[PDB]
Amino acid sequence: AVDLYVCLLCGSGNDEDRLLLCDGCDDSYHTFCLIPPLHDVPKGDWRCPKCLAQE
Ligand SMILES: [Zn+2]
Ligand SMILES: [Zn+2]
């Protein structure tokens, strides 16, 4: 894992450019490999559903 952040769903490393970090919980995923969003990163910090339940 040369890249400081990798996608747990894939962990390619190149996709790190669009890898989104979850502030609600330590979870990283690509905008096109987990959430509807795609090449364009969504505004605000996206959080996986489990974190939403905490709030
Ligand atoms: Zn991914
Ligand atoms: Zn999360």
Side-chain angles (χ1 to χ4, degrees):
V2 172
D3 294 347
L4 303 183
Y5 271 94
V6 303
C7 170
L8 282 293
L9 304 180
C10 333
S12 190
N14 182 91
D15 292 346
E16 183 184 3
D17 293 348
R18 291 189 299 282
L19 176 157
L20 190 98
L21 57 105
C22 174
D23 294 347
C25 87
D26 187 5
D27 186 6
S28 301
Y29 44 70
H30 301 130
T31 65
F32 59 85
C33 90
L34 187 72
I35 67 188
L38 299 174
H39 297 96
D40 185 6
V41 184
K43 287 184 184 325
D45 185 84
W46 220 89
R47 58 197 183 183
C48 349
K50 62 185 191 90
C51 354
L52 182 68
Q54 295 178 343
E55 186 184 2

